[PDB]
Amino acid sequence: RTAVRAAATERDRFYVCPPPSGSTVVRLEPEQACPEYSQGRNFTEGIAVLFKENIAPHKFKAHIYYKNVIVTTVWSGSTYAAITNRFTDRVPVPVQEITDVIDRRGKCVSKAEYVRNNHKVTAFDRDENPVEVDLRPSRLNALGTRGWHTTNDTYTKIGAAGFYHTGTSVNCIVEEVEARSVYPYDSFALSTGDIVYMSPFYGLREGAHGEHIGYAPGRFQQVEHYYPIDLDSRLRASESVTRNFLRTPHFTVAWDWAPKTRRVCSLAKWREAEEMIRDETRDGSFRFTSRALGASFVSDVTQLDLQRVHLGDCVLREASEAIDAIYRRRYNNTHVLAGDRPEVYLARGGFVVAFRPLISNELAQGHLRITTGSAEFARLQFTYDHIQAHVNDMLGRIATAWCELQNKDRTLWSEMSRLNPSAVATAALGQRVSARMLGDVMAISRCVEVRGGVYVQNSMRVPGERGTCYSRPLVTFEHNGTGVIEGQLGDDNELLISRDLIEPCTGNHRRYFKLGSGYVYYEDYSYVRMVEVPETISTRVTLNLTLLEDREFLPLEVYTREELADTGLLDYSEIQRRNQLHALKFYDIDRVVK
Amino acid sequence: RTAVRAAATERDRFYVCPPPSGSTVVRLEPEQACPEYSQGRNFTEGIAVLFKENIAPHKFKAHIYYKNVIVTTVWSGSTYAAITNRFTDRVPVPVQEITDVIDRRGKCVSKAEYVRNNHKVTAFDRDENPVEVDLRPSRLNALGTRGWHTTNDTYTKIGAAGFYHTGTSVNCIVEEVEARSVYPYDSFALSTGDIVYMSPFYGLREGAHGEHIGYAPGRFQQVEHYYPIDLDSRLRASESVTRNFLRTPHFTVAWDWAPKTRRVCSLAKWREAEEMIRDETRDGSFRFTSRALGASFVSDVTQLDLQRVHLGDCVLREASEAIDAIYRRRYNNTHVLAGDRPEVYLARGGFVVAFRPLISNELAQGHLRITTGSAEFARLQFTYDHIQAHVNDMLGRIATAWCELQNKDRTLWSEMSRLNPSAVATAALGQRVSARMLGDVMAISRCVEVRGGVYVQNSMRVPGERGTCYSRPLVTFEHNGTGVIEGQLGDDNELLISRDLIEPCTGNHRRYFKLGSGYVYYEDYSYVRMVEVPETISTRVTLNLTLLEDREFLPLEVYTREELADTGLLDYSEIQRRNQLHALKFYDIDRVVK
Amino acid sequence: RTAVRAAATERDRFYVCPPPSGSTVVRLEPEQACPEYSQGRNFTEGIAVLFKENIAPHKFKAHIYYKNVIVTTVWSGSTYAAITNRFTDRVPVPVQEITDVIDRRGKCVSKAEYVRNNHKVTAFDRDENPVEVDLRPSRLNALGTRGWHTTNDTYTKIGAAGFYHTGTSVNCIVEEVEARSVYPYDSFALSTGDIVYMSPFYGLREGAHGEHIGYAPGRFQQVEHYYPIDLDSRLRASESVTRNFLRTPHFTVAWDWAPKTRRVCSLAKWREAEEMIRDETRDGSFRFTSRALGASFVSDVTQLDLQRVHLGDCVLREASEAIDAIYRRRYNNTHVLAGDRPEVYLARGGFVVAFRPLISNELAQGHLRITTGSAEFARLQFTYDHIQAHVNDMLGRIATAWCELQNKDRTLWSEMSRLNPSAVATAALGQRVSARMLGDVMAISRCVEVRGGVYVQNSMRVPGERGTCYSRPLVTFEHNGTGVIEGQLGDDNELLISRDLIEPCTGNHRRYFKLGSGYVYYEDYSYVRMVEVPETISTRVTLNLTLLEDREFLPLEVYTREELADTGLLDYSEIQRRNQLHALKFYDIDRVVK
Ligand SMILES: *[C@@H]1O[C@H](CO)[C@@H](O)[C@H](O)[C@H]1NC(C)=O
Numbered sequence A, B, C: 001r002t003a004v005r006a007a008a009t010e011r012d013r014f015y016v017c018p019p020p021s022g023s024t025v026v027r028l029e030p031e032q033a034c035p036e037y038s039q040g041r042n043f044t045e046g047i048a049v050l051f052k053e054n055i056a057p058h059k060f061k062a063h064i065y066y067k068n069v070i071v072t073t074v075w076s077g078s079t080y081a082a083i084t085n086r087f088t089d090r091v092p093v094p095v096q097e098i099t100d101v102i103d104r105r106g107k108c109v110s111k112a113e114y115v116r117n118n119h120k121v122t123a124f125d126r127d128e129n130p131v132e133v134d135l136r137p138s139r140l141n142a143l144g145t146r147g148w149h150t151t152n153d154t155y156t157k158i159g160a161a162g163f164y165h166t167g168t169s170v171n172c173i174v175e176e177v178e179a180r181s182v183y184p185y186d187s188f189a190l191s192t193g194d195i196v197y198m199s200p201f202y203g204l205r206e207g208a209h210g211e212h213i214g215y216a217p218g219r220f221q222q223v224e225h226y227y228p229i230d231l232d233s234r235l236r237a238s239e240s241v242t243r244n245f246l247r248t249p250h251f252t253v254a255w256d257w258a259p260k261t262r263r264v265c266s267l268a269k270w271r272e273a274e275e276m277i278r279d280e281t282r283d284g285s286f287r288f289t290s291r292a293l294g295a296s297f298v299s300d301v302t303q304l305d306l307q308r309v310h311l312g313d314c315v316l317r318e319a320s321e322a323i324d325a326i327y328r329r330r331y332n333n334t335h336v337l338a339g340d341r342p343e344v345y346l347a348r349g350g351f352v353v354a355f356r357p358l359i360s361n362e363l364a365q366g367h368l369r370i371t372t373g374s375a376e377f378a379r380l381q382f383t384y385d386h387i388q389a390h391v392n393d394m395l396g397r398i399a400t401a402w403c404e405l406q407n408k409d410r411t412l413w414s415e416m417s418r419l420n421p422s423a424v425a426t427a428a429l430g431q432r433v434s435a436r437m438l439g440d441v442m443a444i445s446r447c448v449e450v451r452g453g454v455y456v457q458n459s460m461r462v463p464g465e466r467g468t469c470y471s472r473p474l475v476t477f478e479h480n481g482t483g484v485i486e487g488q489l490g491d492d493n494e495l496l497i498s499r500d501l502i503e504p505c506t507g508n509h510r511r512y513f514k515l516g517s518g519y520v521y522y523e524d525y526s527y528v529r530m531v532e533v534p535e536t537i538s539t540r541v542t543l544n545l546t547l548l549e550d551r552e553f554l555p556l557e558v559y560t561r562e563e564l565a566d567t568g569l570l571d572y573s574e575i576q577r578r579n580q581l582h583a584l585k586f587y588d589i590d591r592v593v594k
């Protein structure tokens, strides 16, 4: 009939629970309203053709006609000859001579009649009389680089010693040439290095005449219904052309006249987006997403008027073509196109989007200069948006289910609140409380810590009654004023003010009761030992979520600025640097003879 | 009083539950410690100005002064004239003549006095006496490309037949020219194609004299307090300059002298980051994140000393300007700048970050050559980090709530463990067990499978007692040694060793008892049929999480390397290729006359 | 003994629950099968070397040998001299003279003997007799740009007035030159601006002879066992070479012959991936992921045969080198390489991947033209894949735990279904139902709304019995036909058909009963007031998931197309534009003398 002193730790403290009066009354919180997230997105399927700023020059075929005049002064000596001069000059071939000699016969006159220093001057091949010479192809002739000439020889004079002799070579040259024009196209340059200070689209028939010409009107001429001739097979072409001719002091250049608007565009077809999705979730903007491309393009809801664009005719033409070609190939039997024409938008970063919506059979029943850079932002827009939408959708789904689960699981908590309102209110409040059901509502009283040392009684027998025992052990403790309380060991370290927990005594009685950090072992209503229960059972579900690791994105380049500038056979600046030093490098230019 | 043989499937097996002794005792696992993830990040708001490596040349205005000497040899014939020679040469205009004739009067002398082949030589326009000729503007004169000349004519000699005549043209030319200097700036080049082998910042006053000059000291001269004159309105400028003059063998070039450090910088302003956030979560590094830019820049915690940078003066100057301008515009009333100066860092990929922290009013109370490439890594750093931080934060939040929920829900499991310790321990252990509460701890015994065929008894009446019935059906089975057991059908296919489940008989008795894969139907304490219960009730919450789909990022380029190299009017290498073939193409250079 | 009219709102409606017959019987839905997501990925560790398309020209050292012939015509006057002509021409130095005079003595003959206009011509320095002159270095000589010449003077004739005098300068020049060849390498260009129309790898020994030569066979020559000499220290090199010589009309160029396959490759080493992971999860493809690089490269499972590549010899050579070097440095003691050679693949976007798997010590016991652009797609592939895999893994983990948790928590629901089948079935069905356990299955009946006004009875005393009271209040209501029902207030607004809920009366009786939107207060079995219970207790766990915000990725470029084209000292096209205007700008070319 002795006593064992109980031991309490912080976490495993003893508690007294004063009876709850109706002073504080609580209800179990009703089911919450669940978060409803964006279920369904607003969009349009279609076909798109993306256009970029045209950066390429206007390229066209042309012919250069000139006579290569070389004048050589030789000083004939005793046992040698020395070139004292070799003066070279390209001279134009008149239009008359092109059409009437060169096209007509494939011959060229052995003389030149041109203006130099404002004086009318002449040059005769071999210092001889004019003869129409045949134009023979060069040995080096190749596709797009054919040339014809009249001589393989450069005339030089063979004379008497102690004299200066002058010979004159005249080689008539016709060359297939490639021309290039860079915006605004007020000039062009030929494969020969010659720049023509005139518009390639300059003509005399209306529209064309309001194009630049840096040359006097007499230097230019057009020849309508001109049927070109091959200077090898001397055959004419089946279709005629308006042939432009410009006579400069060093050559005559010819090219086929064509109207600017047909030949040139300020924009260029970049890519086709066969499965283009136009998103309409964000307001006042469209977002053109392409799975194929891995790119999103943001534009306004309002269309681009292509009349604002200088030379934007190619857009609608090339866009309708590819869209119509795609439709035929991919949607002909499943869908129908919308609105008898494609829609055109100005997307972020200088991209022009020509989009045409796809309608399923079932649902059918101020001047602008567009500058384009990279499409790097658009792929990033794509990547980000694809992930953001997914994780947003999925967390939405978790949030709702978390709410829904807790709402359902309230049935379990209400049911427990009828039976054990205290353990429910302790879980809810997160602090040790005593509770009583006052019908359909709980009365709450807080539980207070027992600081004065607690002692367990060795026997569990009712003193004065055989056959009746106490179900849980007896304790002695200090709470409030009364220094000693004849109490009982309740549940989860609650000490009971009274001793009313009873049971008829049973044979082979084994009990483990929680007492502080551990357990007290009782055998046949008598204290035995202070045991430990190290074995546990868990109804928990493991959720191991690991973190998304740090990643370092270091600068990465396939080719550098240096590598990209070093691809050429020659570098103008590098050559000039070295070349312009030649006089200072191999001569004393600073010395002066007295 | 017959029997029906029960049918067990794998999943719906019969079990016998031996009584649990205190041999194995368990506790319900206490509430766990919950994961606490990084709640709050360390950062600094501010304003930044990003600087990139200067790739642009130093551009400045200049003037070229030369006399264009053309000497023509004409051979007058019977009925013609032929140019046998036309020798062209640019000659310098002496400084004396620039200041005393050209600036003073707007005139130029009709002769040239220069050195060629180390000999002092002269050239007279029209082979006549020296006259100061007025400089008239060219017809083609435009903004930044003005030129003045003295003649429109090229003098040629008109003489007697059978003779060689020589005429001399001298055109004095002054041209507005644009100059460019590329690092290290020891030379410059003019719009005319001429390279000047000297520093644009070379002077004679201290500092400037230790700059390259590839020319003899006599060829150079500075003119202090020089007031320039317009050669059209012959008005002088209000402010004077130090005027540099360099006389080369072919021209005199003049330019305004300026000190290198003022005019040139090795870095260039790239972008302003108005809302720059400097992250301080990772140690030994700063991360400059810009929402505006969509870029993160990683640098050291230690500042960049701009004294390590060759020509880094522009940085602090231009950074303070833009930061101060931004502050005035965006933060003037809400915040205050910090530390009387902006901080400077060397970020990853060659970016210089000039950052100045923003302090809210409430909180206020070895030589370096910087190489820059792309900012592609920085946008990727940004994207990745923005997503990683969000998903890490959100999963952290799920992890904690999962722990917290299970911790709360332990109140429900403990409560059940008092009432039904077996069903709790079976859920926990994940295997069929029998359990008994030994006070505050459970005794566990495992349940064993009944392999010997089971039979249900047709009646549920107590033999020998009217008015008392068995609550659940009677069974017969084989377990351990004893071949026949007079048992009862327990819960969820548990077969009971005994027959102690009793109830006073009731009128209109209908029962469905689980027996193997299905149910046994009993009516008024008598077997009827083997029914199926196909209807279910579920308290589950659906969570449909779908996977983030695979995405293919295919190579994408707006303009190729080819497209970017093809934008020019001429290509030096292409022209040279064709041009240097001309002799081989239109002549036989290999033939020799015997 | 009066009555108070109850008030019902939508959400807090009154219900009558008809008794359930076995008409509808339900079971609680058994535990579900849980989703099992991809646990474990298939991959190979190794080392990789990435190769890109070679964009760089073939660069090699060379020497240019020529004699700079200048012929000057001076007209001596009264008090002056005028240059009437200055004709410049570069002439070749014969191979004989290079080896026998220039290499042998470091001297060059003061005359030139060359062919011009098909005529054999001579040039004498100072119009004097041939002398072997020493080659002296230029003042400007620098590393890689050395030059040697024979004179600093340009010979001019000083004569009698009224006469034309002609002088001849011959300067023999040898220059260290840099050569460049661009694919297909059928020509090369020198630092001087000269293009050599021949292959740098053309030779006469087998293999080399099937390479382009645009020159007659006599113009070329190889010199085997040639030991070069420094023209400063007149020392010979220790190792000999096969020396190529090509005599063009303007110079002799020499270079060391080397075989094409050794000197040139169509691919170039880009980066080393020390920790390259080759993923094998997607079928019919490999994915080469590099943490270091932040890039993923997609290729076929089938290797690249490098015999399909024109000049692909560098790949295997350079790949084995770096891989073997890396292994030695990082894996020598932990792993072993696999398969006696590296594997080679053709990745997406023109990248060649040379991968060699790493085997841990423990586990050991048609013609192709490759075009490369950017690696932008590969970093995006990397970023996306890294995130996708993580979030997919983590949601998988949530999905399984959600299933597992609900499966466990079924133990709680079954247990409640025995005690309160109605509250379980109401939670499950999401509608108010009455339920009865018919053994191991529930009988369900739906609950109907009470529309006819309800009234609570002021007393809770059993009329006719003292000491016995009703536990819950009495009500009067209208349901079905019977206009008045002597009922009782049940749980959660259920009205009971009968009045069988009883309790022995207790002293100090306080009760709150739910009645519609609120509560009814009862004191000592008598009505008092209609109270409100505003205080709640919650067992809910907060889960605050916020959305991933929209981000705008705006176009961002470090340097523009314009900025990148403006880095050069000169621009060929810009210079030519201005230069070719000179005649039109400073002269009247259109005027003609009559
Ligand atoms: C040049 O010479 C070749 C023969 O070597 C000949 O075929 C060709 O027709 C000649 N061309 C001219 C224009 O004389």
Ligand SMILES: *[C@@H]1O[C@H](CO)[C@@H](O)[C@H](O)[C@H]1NC(C)=O
Binding pocket: B135, B136, B137, B149, B150, B151, B152, C588
């Ligand atoms: C050139 O001629 C035009 C008239 O055609 C005239 O206006 C201009 O002043 C002249 N220039 C010179 C330098 O003679």
Ligand SMILES: *[C@@H]1O[C@H](CO)[C@@H](O)[C@H](O)[C@H]1NC(C)=O
Binding pocket: A588, C135, C136, C137, C149, C150, C151, C152
């Ligand atoms: C050129 O002159 C310098 C002296 O000014 C001298 O050192 C050099 O050797 C000379 N070169 C030749 C080739 O005469």
